[PDB]
């Protein structure tokens, strides 16, 4: 299925599959929403800043894998975003934010400026 992107442009490979059905369909900032970096993982939800992410279309059973390996138990809520490539999922926070850091830019990076 066609996901977003918020780990970085360089994404991860995962295993395999994130470097062989993955589908470049393009770069896609999008506004209006902010990234929290909670330690590990980041997360992103509905705000105010430009999320400088990529937008990739993967095997719909590679989204199963992520889904099942992401939140497994409860940890986060599908964002069903419509993007010009394409419907993609987003992961929104879930759990409290308390304690956590703001990108309010919307970039992994940013500081390079």
Same mark, same amino acid.
């Given at each position: 299925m066609r996901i977003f992107v918020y780990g970085s442009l360089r994404h991860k490979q995962g295993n395999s599959h +994130?470097?062989?059905?993955?589908? %470049? %369909? @393009? #770069?896609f900032s999008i506004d209006n929403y902010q990234l929290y970096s909670l330690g590990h993982y980041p997360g992103a939800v509905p705000g105010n800043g430009t999320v400088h992410g990529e937008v990739y279309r993967?095997?719909?059973?590679?989204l199963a894998e992520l889904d099942a390996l992401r939140t497994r138990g409860g940890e986060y809520a599908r964002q069903l975003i419509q993007t010009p490539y @394409?419907?993609? +999922?987003? !992961?929104? !926070?879930?759990?409290?934010?308390?304690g956590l850091k703001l990108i309010e830019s919307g #970039? +992994? %990076?940013?500081?390079?400026?």
């Open positions: +994130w470097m062989t059905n993955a589908q %470049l %369909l @393009g #770069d993967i095997d719909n059973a590679t @394409g419907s993609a +999922w987003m !992961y929104v !926070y879930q759990r409290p934010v308390d #970039d +992994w %990076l940013d500081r390079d400026k």
